[PDB]
Amino acid sequence: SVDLIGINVAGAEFTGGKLPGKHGTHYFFPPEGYFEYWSEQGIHTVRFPLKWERLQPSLNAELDDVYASLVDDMLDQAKENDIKVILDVHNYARYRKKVIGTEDVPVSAYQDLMERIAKRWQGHDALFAYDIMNQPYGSADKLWPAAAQAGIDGVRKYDKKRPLLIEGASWSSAARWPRYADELLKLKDPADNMVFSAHVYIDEDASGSYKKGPGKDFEPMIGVKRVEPFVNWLKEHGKKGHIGEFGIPNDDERWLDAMDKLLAYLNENCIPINYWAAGPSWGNYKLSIEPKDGEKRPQVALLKKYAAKDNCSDFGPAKA
Numbered sequence: 001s002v003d004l005i006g007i008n009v010a011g012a013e014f015t016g017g018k019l020p021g022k023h024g025t026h027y028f029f030p031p032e033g034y035f036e037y038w039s040e041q042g043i044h045t046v047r048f049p050l051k052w053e054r055l056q057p058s059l060n061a062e063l064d065d066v067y068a069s070l071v072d073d074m075l076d077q078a079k080e081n082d083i084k085v086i087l088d089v090h091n092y093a094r095y096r097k098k099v100i101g102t103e104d105v106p107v108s109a110y111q112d113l114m115e116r117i118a119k120r121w122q123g124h125d126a127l128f129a130y131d132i133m134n135q136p137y138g139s140a141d142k143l144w145p146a147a148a149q150a151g152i153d154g155v156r157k158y159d160k161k162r163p164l165l166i167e168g169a170s171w172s173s174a175a176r177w178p179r180y181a182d183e184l185l186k187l188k189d190p191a192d193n194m195v196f197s198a199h200v201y202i203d204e205d206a207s208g209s210y211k212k213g214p215g216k217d218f219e220p221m222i223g224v225k226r227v228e229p230f231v232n233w234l235k236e237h238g239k240k241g242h243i244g245e246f247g248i249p250n251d252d253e254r255w256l257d258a259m260d261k262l263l264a265y266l267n268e269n270c271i272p273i274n275y276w277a278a279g280p281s282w283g284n285y286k287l288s289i290e291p292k293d294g295e296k297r298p299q300v301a302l303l304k305k306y307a308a309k310d311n312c313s314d315f316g317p318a319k320a
């Protein structure tokens with residue numbers, strides 16, 4: 001089933017300069033009892049970032065034993081707690097800072113990664129979908145459509161059923177989506193089960209930094225206005241969509257107002273969302289919705305409100 005309300009659970013991609021890095025010092029998977037909290041809150045879909053260089057520290061080589069086994073245990077815990085997992089290769093279309101499709105990182109190496117991910121986990125009941133690449137941007141934008149096809153081809157060698165979440169150029173901007181996305185119309189999925197996934201932050205530059213407050217001339221519909229280009233493109237092209245990232249600070253009613261209006265518009269169009277972010281090691285990170293003594297998470301009440309409003313059977317938007 002397709003849940004409209006979900007969360008990112010971040011931590012396994014942390015401290016990206018420390019490779020392989022040490023679990024519990026530089027990066028963090030969910031501890032025991034982690035998923036039971038969110039399951040109790042009524043949240044049942046999780047987007048889970050993974051670092052490519054940790055999963056596969058040499059291109060074209062077998063997956064890393066330590067890191068892949070942590071993914072195994074996370075999916076086991078997800079299954080135990082009725083959580084559906086979207087695995088996210090959280091790499092900005094780059095491997096050790098070089099763009100997929102350059103001589104350093106041929107598309108065949110990215111296809112190899114995706115084959116190994118599907119081969120290892122397509123048999124796991126908690127696996128829901130593959131988000132094949134987080135936020136291509138910059139020098140990767142031009143090459144990303146060709147890389148995406150290689151990644152699709154990779155997953156489909158071993159998993160011919162699950163949805164593939166396909167992000168776009170320019171940090172998968174929902175607001176700028178139609179400026180670049182026409183290049184993705186050439187993508188071919190033999191299983192015909194692709195879902196496009198855009199991101200939206202509502203600070204001025206949409207970086208999700210929220211360096212400033214909302215400001216005097218803040219528009220509560222900014223979230224809706226920034227996903228409208230994406231959703232309208234989906235309708236125009238008969239495609240299915242998804243919002244893989246959106247988060248706001250906890251300290252201004254204007255942000256929550258924009259959130260509530262955004263969720264209402266996504267609900268009208270059966271577009272799921274993954275809130276950025278929960279996770280086991282966020283500290284006082286301004287966008288965290290993980291419980292923390294003395295910190296209020298008003299965003300989670302909005303998520304729960306719209307989870308009870310979820311009456312969709314599949315990814316929208318609906319086709320006329």
Ligand SMILES: OC[C@H]1O[C@@H](O[C@H]2[C@H](O)[C@@H](O)[C@H](O[C@H]3[C@H](O)[C@@H](O)[C@@H](O)O[C@@H]3CO)O[C@@H]2CO)[C@H](O)[C@@H](O)[C@@H]1O
Nearest residue numbers: 135170171172173199200201204205206207208209245
């Ligand atoms: O969206 C999260 C993602 O944001 C990255 O910052 C990006 C912004 O996404 C992007 O909107 C912004 O685009 C500005 C652009 O730099 C300017 O040329 C001009 O056109 O105004 C645009 C804003 O409307 O650029 C920043 C990068 O500078 C983060 O880097 C990234 O970590 C984050 O995940």
